Amino acid sequence: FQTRAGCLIGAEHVNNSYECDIPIGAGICASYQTQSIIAYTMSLGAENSVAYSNNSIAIPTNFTISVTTEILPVSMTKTSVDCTMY
Amino acid sequence: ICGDSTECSNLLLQYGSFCTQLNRALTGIAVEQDKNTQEVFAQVKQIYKTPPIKDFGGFNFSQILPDPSKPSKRSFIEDLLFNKVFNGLTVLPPLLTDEMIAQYTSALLAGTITSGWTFGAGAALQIPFAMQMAYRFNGIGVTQNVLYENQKLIANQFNSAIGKIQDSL
Amino acid sequence: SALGKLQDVVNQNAQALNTLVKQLSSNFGAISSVLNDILSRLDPPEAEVQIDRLITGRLQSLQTYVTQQLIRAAEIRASANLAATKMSECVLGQSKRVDFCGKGYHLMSFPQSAPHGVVFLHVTYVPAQEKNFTTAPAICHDGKAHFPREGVFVSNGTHWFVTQRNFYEPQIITTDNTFVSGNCDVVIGIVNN
Amino acid sequence: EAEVQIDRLITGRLQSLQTYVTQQLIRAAEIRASANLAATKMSECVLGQS
Amino acid sequence: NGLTGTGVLTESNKKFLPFQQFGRDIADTTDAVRDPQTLEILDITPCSFG
Numbered sequence: 382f383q384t385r386a387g388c389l390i391g392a393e394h395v396n397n398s399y400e401c402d403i404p405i406g407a408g409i410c411a412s413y414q415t416q417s418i419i420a421y422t423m424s425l426g427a428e429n430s431v432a433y434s435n436n437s438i439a440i441p442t443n444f445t446i447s448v449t450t451e452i453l454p455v456s457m458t459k460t461s462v463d464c465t466m467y
Numbered sequence: 468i469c470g471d472s473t474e475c476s477n478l479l480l481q482y483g484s485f486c487t488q489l490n491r492a493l494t495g496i497a498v499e500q501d502k503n504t505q506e507v508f509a510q511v512k513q514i515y516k517t518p519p520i521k522d523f524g525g526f527n528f529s530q531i532l533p534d535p536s537k538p539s540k541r542s543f544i545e546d547l548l549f550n551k552v553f554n555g556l557t558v559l560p561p562l563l564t565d566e567m568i569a570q571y572t573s574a575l576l577a578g579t580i581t582s583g584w585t586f587g588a589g590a591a592l593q594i595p596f597a598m599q600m601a602y603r604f605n606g607i608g609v610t611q612n613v614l615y616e617n618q619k620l621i622a623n624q625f626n627s628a629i630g631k632i633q634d635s636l
Numbered sequence: 637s638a639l640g641k642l643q644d645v646v647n648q649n650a651q652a653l654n655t656l657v658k659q660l661s662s663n664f665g666a667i668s669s670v671l672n673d674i675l676s677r678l679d680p681p682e683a684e685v686q687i688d689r690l691i692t693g694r695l696q697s698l699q700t701y702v703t704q705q706l707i708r709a710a711e712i713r714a715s716a717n718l719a720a721t722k723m724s725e726c727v728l729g730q731s732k733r734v735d736f737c738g739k740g741y742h743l744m745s746f747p748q749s750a751p752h753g754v755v756f757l758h759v760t761y762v763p764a765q766e767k768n769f770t771t772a773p774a775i776c777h778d779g780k781a782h783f784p785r786e787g788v789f790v791s792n793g794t795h796w797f798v799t800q801r802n803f804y805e806p807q808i809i810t811t812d813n814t815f816v817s818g819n820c821d822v823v824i825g826i827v828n829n
Numbered sequence: 830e831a832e833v834q835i836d837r838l839i840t841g842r843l844q845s846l847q848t849y850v851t852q853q854l855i856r857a858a859e860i861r862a863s864a865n866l867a868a869t870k871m872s873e874c875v876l877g878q879s
Numbered sequence: 880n881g882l883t884g885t886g887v888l889t890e891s892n893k894k895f896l897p898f899q900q901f902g903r904d905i906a907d908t909t910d911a912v913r914d915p916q917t918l919e920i921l922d923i924t925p926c927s928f929g
């Protein structure tokens with residue numbers, strides 16, 4: 382199969398679009414489905430038209446409480462090398 | 468360094484692993500270039516589309532909305548921007564094409580024209596565009612009647628000021 | 637019972653120290669990689685020429701290690717400054733910056749310590765189960781235009797209410813939740829009620 | 830005699846390649862901060878009112 | 880004639896000047912040549928790698 386990233390051997394080119402799994406490049410990704418290795422154009426997401434008009438409004442009637450995590454590196458290992466003994 | 472000659476290539480082995488380090492460094496900076504784009508543009512879950520009949524209270528977004536007869540389905544102003552700007556060396560392509568990034572910006576732009584700031588906090592909830600403009604006027608400390616009584620003037624000023632970006636570029 | 641952004645730092649630093657250790661076994665164009673085997677079977681005038689190539693190679697190894705540590709410490713400092721700013725603005729206050737403290741309307745945050753980092757637990761409010769309604773900018777009554785004080789005018793199909801904009805809680809339109817400004821002939825979309 | 834002359838080229842070319850790779854690390858660390866600011870402006874000016 | 884290299888030679892659409900014997904581009908790599916018997920100029924392309 383000929384991509385714009387190069388020539389790809391050993392993967393079948395399907396026609397459906399999934400989320401990206403292993404990036405090949407120039408818009409192509411690969412994944413292990415079903416049992417074989419397939420290559421496809423990635424999808425950006427599901428489509429959605431909003432019911433816009435000039436006198437319509439959507440107002441929520443309930444809510445959820447969400448808790449999510451965020452991880453950040455603060456520090457690293459302090460190392461010294463004696464330049465002469467090295 | 469050697470250019471396919473076994474004499475130079477054997478002498479090079481005496482230098483250890485300098486050339487595995489250099490490749491590791493360049494690979495580490497070529498992966499983060501795609502990470503850079505993913506975090507600016509993939510800020511939506513859905514790809515939102517704008518309605519076919521576009522009446523936004525007098526505001527006119529036609530020079531920044533996608534144009535089907537154009538290359539890569541870009542907006543009119545995204546085109547002016549794309550027109551203004553061997554031996555062991557290769558260039559790798561980016562993971563997202565330019566078509567994909569123009570798709571991402573048109574989904575952001577249709578989300579904001581149509582739902583205000585609600586789609587960045589949850590599900591998109593539609594609201595008429597002038598009522599959204601009135602909420603934004605409230606957010607800077609002006610009352611809403613000042614928008615509703617000056618709607619046509621505010622819309623004309625906005626249209627005429629979007630028309631000047633296009634000239635200056 | 638995830639942490640790859642912390643394991644990446646550990647792995648990159650171990651991978652650099654391993655390369656520095658392993659470059660101690662290259663000749664760099666000398667006869668031996670071990671200095672004692674040049675010293676034992678050579679005399680000073682010719683030991684010196686072989687020792688100088690080892691010195692040259694090992695100095696360059698060490699300099700590459702130190703430059704790449706300096707570039708990586710500057711990336712760790714930006715991360716720690718961002719984590720300090722999140723600790724001040726997300727744990728010691730409530731933020732209005734969108735997406736700064738999680739997805740949704742920030743309510744609060746809790747810190748937790750990690751091996752070389754920090755984990756923030758962000759509590760946010762996410763609205764749910766939206767319904768459709770008809771809206772109007774203003775109400776017209778007695779030849780006057782009425783605007784909501786804080787909310788929106790909504791119709792369930794037959795009746796008009798005021799509600800707050802994030803939670804549906806309909807109330808009667810009175811002179812206590814509205815204010816007046818002008819006639820009902822200038823604003824585009826007034827309804828009569 | 831060609832070993833001594835090939836090593837002089839090897840040393841120079843290695844130096845030049847490694848200078849190229851250092852200056853790219855320093856330039857990428859600057860592009861990274863610009864993209865981090867662009868990601869914050871997309872959140873705070875496009876999906877909100879600042 | 881002494882111009883030594885390796886690659887794949889194709890026929891070209893350049894036009895030298897009668898005294899010019901080979902061409903080179905920016906970065907000064909040889910990308911064309913004249914052969915000394917046909918008096919025809921040939922494009923030089925590096926042999927695929929990756």
Ligand SMILES: *[C@@H]1O[C@H](CO)[C@@H](O[C@@H]2O[C@H](CO)[C@@H](O)[C@H](O)[C@H]2NC(C)=O)[C@H](O)[C@H]1NC(C)=O
Binds near residue numbers: 527528529530
């Ligand atoms: C929004 O503004 C654009 C101007 O950029 C209007 O489109 C052009 O209008 C002129 C004047 O009639 C025409 O000559 C062009 O053919 C129009 N199309 C272009 C330039 O692509 C557009 O009509 C405006 N929208 C509304 C609803 O008025």
Ligand SMILES: *[C@@H]1O[C@H](CO)[C@@H](O[C@@H]2O[C@H](CO)[C@@H](O)[C@H](O)[C@H]2NC(C)=O)[C@H](O)[C@H]1NC(C)=O
Binds near residue numbers: 432439768
């Ligand atoms: C508000 O009303 C609109 C328009 O009536 C609804 O939009 C529908 O969206 C679906 C998408 O699955 C379309 O197939 C329908 O044609 C649309 N119109 C309908 C059902 O009349 C929208 O779903 C409504 N919103 C809510 C929250 O109920």
Ligand SMILES: *[C@@H]1O[C@H](CO)[C@@H](O[C@@H]2O[C@H](CO)[C@@H](O)[C@H](O)[C@H]2NC(C)=O)[C@H](O)[C@H]1NC(C)=O
Binds near residue numbers: 792793795
């Ligand atoms: C819109 O809401 C109004 C008021 O909530 C509804 O009118 C009331 O409906 C109840 C139904 O049991 C009656 O008992 C009341 O007498 C009605 N009038 C009042 C309270 O003043 C109306 O039915 C709703 N309309 C729709 C289409 O749902």
Ligand SMILES: *[C@@H]1O[C@H](CO)[C@@H](O[C@@H]2O[C@H](CO)[C@@H](O)[C@H](O)[C@H]2NC(C)=O)[C@H](O)[C@H]1NC(C)=O
Binds near residue numbers: 435436824825
């Ligand atoms: C909002 O849009 C609706 C429909 O696009 C407008 O209703 C039209 O109003 C004009 C004049 O008021 C009529 O000539 C059309 O026949 C109406 N359309 C339909 C389908 O009935 C409405 O005027 C717009 N403005 C608002 C509600 O303020």
Ligand SMILES: *[C@@H]1O[C@H](CO)[C@@H](O[C@@H]2O[C@H](CO)[C@@H](O)[C@H](O)[C@H]2NC(C)=O)[C@H](O)[C@H]1NC(C)=O
Binds near residue numbers: 828
């Ligand atoms: C809302 O009610 C007002 C009256 O309170 C209506 O105003 C009348 O409009 C007609 C037609 O435009 C005029 O001929 C009358 O002179 C108006 N009377 C007054 C007292 O202003 C208005 O038309 C109504 N509008 C709707 C949409 O119901």
Ligand SMILES: *[C@@H]1O[C@H](CO)[C@@H](O[C@@H]2O[C@H](CO)[C@@H](O)[C@H](O)[C@H]2NC(C)=O)[C@H](O)[C@H]1NC(C)=O
Binds near residue numbers: 915916917918
């Ligand atoms: C080099 O010599 C050969 C002959 O030894 C020439 O080849 C002739 O070229 C002409 C074109 O001008 C042809 O019409 C003849 O058929 C060729 N003959 C043979 C035997 O090959 C060639 O032209 C000479 N070139 C130079 C530059 O001297």
Ligand SMILES: *[C@@H]1O[C@H](CO)[C@@H](O)[C@H](O)[C@H]1NC(C)=O
Binds near residue numbers: 394395396
């Ligand atoms: C993919 O879809 C295109 C539709 O244009 C079709 O021509 C092509 O044969 C399809 N390929 C496969 C493997 O189904």
